[PDB]
Antibody, heavy 214, light 214 residues
Framework: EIQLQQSGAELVRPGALVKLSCKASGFNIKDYYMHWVKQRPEQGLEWIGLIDPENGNTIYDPKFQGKASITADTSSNTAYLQLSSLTSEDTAVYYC??????????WGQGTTLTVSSAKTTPPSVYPLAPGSAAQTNSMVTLGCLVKGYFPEPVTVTWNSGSLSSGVHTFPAVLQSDLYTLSSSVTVPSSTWPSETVTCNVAHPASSTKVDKKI | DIKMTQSPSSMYASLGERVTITCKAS??????LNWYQQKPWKSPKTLIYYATSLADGVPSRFSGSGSGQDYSLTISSLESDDTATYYCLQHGESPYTFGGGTKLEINRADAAPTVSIFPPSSEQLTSGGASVVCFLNNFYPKDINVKWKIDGSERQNGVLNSWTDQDSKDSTYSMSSTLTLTKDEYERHNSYTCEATHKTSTSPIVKSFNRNEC
């Protein structure tokens, strides 16, 4: 029903400017306050500002005065967030949220903004299969190695999300303009190779979508 | 303008234990304080609003109280999936301010990891690279150490280690260790072993394989 769509991911250069969008569905933005929230990598949430889309009032946190500018378009149901003169510190996940007067009831999935001069590099996806039954149980442990991609993020999935039980996705580690990430799924010895176990990888910043059957 | 202090920063508690998180403001915020829960890499979820009211679909084991500048959230009987980061948010004055957050980890009975080791996949060898991956799953406590040995106590450098966050279901942790090499260097060595030391046993777990790939 109600959903706040965000741009998802973008690689921007130090010193430039960027404009992020937040498209609302199911409800009118003129009726609510829309907020913009930031969260740096291993860090806390930070409040950026709000806007009353009805008759355009905006309040920011002094920290972002003349750095952040919020706009909204009642006819396209979209809130906007432009940042300027980007530096490393602006690398974060920016979320938009709906204020119902009591609390933030709907959030967007966020947009990872990476301020850097490295280029976009799509991931190599490699399957991890056992050299005989992974006997550290009567459950076979399989996997996928997603390496050398930039920027973040990637969303790995198994059997299109049908396999969520026994899944372990290990966060990415950066090593020179490149990240490596892995995932493991542990299934019963009765379902493989008999049933198809496939891992789906998607890298938004390069429009790459790969499916590896193991 | 209004500074929020959250305490503690991080805490450990056992299942069925009662927990209390604190938030104090620099000035009376007139009960305009909310609590949010953030599960790793998911947008925040509201637990409590206006100091004591329970938000959408939150269990009754959660409660809140406080007035003036002192506030607290309390979880009566800890459930495994209360692992998350909790934040308080004051909205009594503009700009709205988040406390620094407190991370909650479930203390649990030690568990030994199940180890798996995968040699370089064919797909990758075909491109000049050789990655060797080692999975250490469902162990507790998080404290663990892995070493890679190539042809003897001759251990190496060029490894990427990553830990998941704590499991919401069974409260364990998992780790991925990847030794990355060139096809070239891989084919000059015989045995690859990754050893792990974890207090659940005085003996190290030596998981091995001989390339002897013909």
């Amino acid at each position: 029903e109600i959903q706040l769509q965000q741009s998802g991911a973008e690689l921007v250069r130090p010193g430039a400017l960027v404009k992020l969008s937040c498209k609302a569905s199911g409800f009118n933005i003129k009726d609510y306050y829309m907020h913009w929230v930031k969260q740096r990598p291993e860090q806390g949430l930070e409040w950026i500002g709000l806007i009353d889309p009805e008759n355009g009032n905006t309040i920011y946190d002094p920290k972002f005065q003349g750095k952040a500018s919020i706009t909204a378009d009642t006819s396209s149901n979209t809130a906007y967030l432009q940042l300027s003169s980007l530096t490393s510190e602006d690398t974060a996940v920016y979320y938009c949220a709906r204020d119902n007067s009591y609390y933030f009831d709907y959030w967007g999935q966020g947009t990872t903004l990476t301020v850097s001069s490295a280029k976009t590099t799509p991931p190599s996806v490699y399957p991890l299969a056992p050299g005989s039954a992974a006997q550290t149980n009567s459950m076979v442990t399989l996997g996928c190695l997603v390496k050398g991609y930039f920027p973040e993020p990637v969303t790995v999935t198994w059997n299109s999300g049908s396999l969520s039980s026994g899944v372990h996705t290990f966060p990415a580690v950066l090593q020179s303009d490149l990240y490596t990430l892995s995932s493991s799924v542990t299934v019963p010895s009765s379902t493989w190779p008999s049933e198809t176990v496939t891992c789906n990888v998607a890298h938004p910043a390069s429009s790459t979508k790969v499916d590896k059957k193991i | 303008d209004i500074k929020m202090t959250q305490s503690p920063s991080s805490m450990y508690a056992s299942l069925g234990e009662r927990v209390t998180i604190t938030c104090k403001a620099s000035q009376d915020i007139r009960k305009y304080l909310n609590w949010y829960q953030q599960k790793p890499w998911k947008s925040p979820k509201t637990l409590i609003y206006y100091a004591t009211s329970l938000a959408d679909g939150v269990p009754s084991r959660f409660s809140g109280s406080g007035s003036g500048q002192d506030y607290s959230l309390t979880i009566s009987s800890l459930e495994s999936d209360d692992t998350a980061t909790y934040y308080c948010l004051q909205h009594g004055e503009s700009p709205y301010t988040f406390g620094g957050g407190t991370k909650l980890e479930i203390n649990r009975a030690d568990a030994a990891p199940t180890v798996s080791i995968f040699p370089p996949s064919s797909e990758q060898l075909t491109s000049g690279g050789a990655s060797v991956v080692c999975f250490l799953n469902n162990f507790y406590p998080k404290d663990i150490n892995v070493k890679w040995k190539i042809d003897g106590s001759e251990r190496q450098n060029g490894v990427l280690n990553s830990w998941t966050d704590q499991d919401s279901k069974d409260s364990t942790y998992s780790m991925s260790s990847t030794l990355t090499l060139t096809k070239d260097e891989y084919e000059r060595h015989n045995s690859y072993t990754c050893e792990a030391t974890h207090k659940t046993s005085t003996s190290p777990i030596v998981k091995s394989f001989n390339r002897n790939e013909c």
